[model samples]
Structures are given as structure tokens and as C-alpha cells.
Target: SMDRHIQQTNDRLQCIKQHLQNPANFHNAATELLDWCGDPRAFQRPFEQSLMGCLTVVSRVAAQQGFDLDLGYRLLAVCAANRDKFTPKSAALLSSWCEELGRLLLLRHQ
Candidate 1:
């Protein structure tokens, strides 16, 4: 049921690229695109993973489509506004190579 739900939502949102090359982290990115589009929250276990995954797909789509996401700049503002929202994700990011991974994902290489 969850898989079907995500599929339907992605189709409606154009989340899937033409080649079907979903980001390396499929479920995580899928969940964010759904969440930001006003869908319900997911299980939310590995928070940083989903965060980076979202950045990857969103940045890619934005650049390829000639748009932009100012999300990177918002990080600091949120850090002071209410850190609990991002703290868990930050820890998860620093624990592995995911910090660098997320940065790479946000690059506008197009």
C-alpha cells in the first residue's frame, strides 16, 4: 500500500525523471517530495538520509529545468529558528560520508 501510494503521488508530481534513474536513495527522496507537496509524513527513521536524498533529486530537477532552490541558504536560518527539526539529520550526515554526499547533490552541474 505504501509503495503504491508513493508511486501515485510521484506520478502526479513529476518526481520521476524520463530515464527512471531515481536517486541512489529512492524511498527517502520519494518521501520528501511527497511530504513537501503536502502529503503525510513518513516513518522518519533515518532523517538525514531522507534529507540528503531530497536535496539530490530536487537540485537535479531544478537545475536541469533551469530553475533554482534556495534551500542551502535556508539551513542557517532554520538552525536558529528551531534546531530540533534539523539536528537529527545533521548528526546522521556527519556520522558518515553523507555530508559530502548531500553537498554534491545540491550542486548545479547542469
Candidate 2:
């Protein structure tokens, strides 16, 4: 039997997966997922850490789902734009992660 929190997490992940299946909704779904990450009430952990974890997880899922470089780069830009609100370490980590994600996407173009 799944815990309630685990069940909810699975449901949300399914929704994200469904949203990603349609290219037209890719940006909006990514943005919505990021916004959810920024919400403090969405997790048991501290907002920043939870948000970072969410970003990492969702970005990886997005990549696996074949989200294109343009969307990946846009997510990176969005994270950069919000860095001032995060702790130094968190900001640095996210920035570095975004850069790596972007680079991986770009390299596929070659």
C-alpha cells in the first residue's frame, strides 16, 4: 500500500508526464511544474530544498520525455532569473545543473 504522500506524488508525476506528451504544452507544463516547486506548502521539506529537488527531478523527466533544447534552455533561464531568492549554495547548484542540462541538449544538435 502506498503512503498518501507517495500516492499524491505519483499522481502529480503522471499529470506531468501526460502534459509533456503534447509538444504544445511543454513550456506551460514546465513552467507550471517550476511554479509548484516554488510553493512552500507543496512539500514536507523546506521550500528551497524541495524546490531544488523538484527541479532536478522534473528536468530529468522532461529530458527523458524528449523535451527539446529550446525548452530546456528556457527552464535554465527561468532558474537563473530567480536565483537571487535562493541561498548561495542552492543558487549555485541550480545554476550549474541548468548549465549542464542545457549543454547536454545543445550537444545533441551536433
Candidate 3:
């Protein structure tokens, strides 16, 4: 069940990625994805929770792979910097998220 759920979520993320690849669809796709994430009751069972669940899994995987969660946040910050060249607003949001994640990781490590 977990695998199936992960696959489904991955598929949805892939669709978001595809949509983001084209400027024409980026806003709508991002909005939809954020909306889905904002609502904890939308996804089923294990996923029927906060967006933090997805983030925790990603952080765990990174930790398992010998990468600290802070490193991931740093990487995200780098991406945000580059992304700001095009979409400043989105990049600012991304940077803020990265900062939040970085703080979380610090708390986790401590």
C-alpha cells in the first residue's frame, strides 16, 4: 500500500514537473500542486496528512544516503537563487521554504 501510494504521488509530481517545464502551464500547475499539499485531507490513508510527511520522507532518504538534510536545503537555496533569474516571486517563496527546511533539519540534528 505504501509503495502504491508513493507511486501515485510520484506520478502526480511528475505531472507537476511536466507542467512546470512549460511557462504556459507553470502557474496553474504550481497552484494545483500547492493546493493539494495545503489540504491534509485530500490524499488517502498515509498521505492524508500534512505536506511535512512528504518532506520527512525526503529528509530520511537523504540522511540514509549520507547527505544531511541541511545539504538538501543548501541545494534548494542554490536552485532558488538560479530560479530567481526568471521568477523572482517563486524564487523568494522557494528560498523561504529552504530556510524553513534548514531550520527543521537543524532541530532534527540537535
Candidate 4:
């Protein structure tokens, strides 16, 4: 089971990695993050390390490239609301980053 868990986690990370490296398909990357965020199994372990890393990369790319990542904000908000599922540090970081990005995309492709 441990090996399977590790394999699955690695697989998911690789999926995110593809989007991360691909650069053009930001939507699929955010969708992957949202899927992880909504999964109960992800909260069962110390999953913040890579998750936060990917989020930072995703957010940084979105901010710099002018991508409308409203889903990113929503993912953070949901995670913040369900704070009990995460460690104090994880929850704090999520809340902090949530405030970093808001509804900044009012108009698209202007």
C-alpha cells in the first residue's frame, strides 16, 4: 500500500509537472490542483510541501503571464475554510496566499 500510495502521488505530481513544464495549458494545471485540494486523502498526510511549491509556481506564472486563475483563488478559499484538515502552518500559509490573489480578472483578453 505504501508503494502504491507513493506511486499514485508521484503520478499525480507528474501530471502537474507536465502542465508546469508545458507552460501553455495553465487551465489543466489549475484543474489538477483543484482536484487534489478536493480530495480527502491529500489531507491525510503532510502534503503541503510539493502542493505549496506547485501552487507558488502556478500563481507566479499566472500573475506574470496575465492568466485568469480564478480557480486558484477558489481552491485556496476552500482549503482555508476547511482549515481543520491541515496543520496550523499549512492553514496559515494557505490563508496568506489566498489573500495574495483575489478576483483580479474582471475582464478577459482585453
Model 4 / residue 5 / CA error / Å: 2.3
After superposition, which runs of candidate 3 have C-alpha atoms over 4 Å from their true positions? 1-71
Pairs with steric clashes in candidate 1: none
Sort the candidates on lDDT, descending order.
Answer: 4, 2, 3, 1
Ranking by TM-score: 4, 2, 3, 1
Query: RMSD (Cα, Å) of candidate 3?
Result: 14.2
Query: 56 in model 1: Cα distance from truth in Å?
Result: 2.6
Residue by residue across 1-110, what tens digits does model 2's lDDT show? 22456656656756765675566677777777656545544433334454565566545655665566566566655766677778788778778778877777777787
Q: State the lDDT of candidate 4 residue by residue for 46-83, as single tens digits.
A: 45556666666654665545454676677667667776
- Per-residue CA lDDT of candidate 1, range 18-94, in tens? 22134343434434444443322432333334444444444344323233224322332232233344457554443
Q: How accurate is candidate 3 locally (lDDT)?
A: 0.49
Candidate 3, residues 40-89, lDDT tens digits: the string is 34433443222333333333333333434454465444444444343455
Task: Return the top candidate by lDDT.
Answer: 4
lDDT of each: 0.38, 0.62, 0.49, 0.64
TM-score of each: 0.28, 0.53, 0.36, 0.69
Error of 3 at 65 (Å): 15
Location of the lowest summed lDDT over 10 successive residues in candidate 2: 39-48
Clashes of each: 0, 0, 0, 0
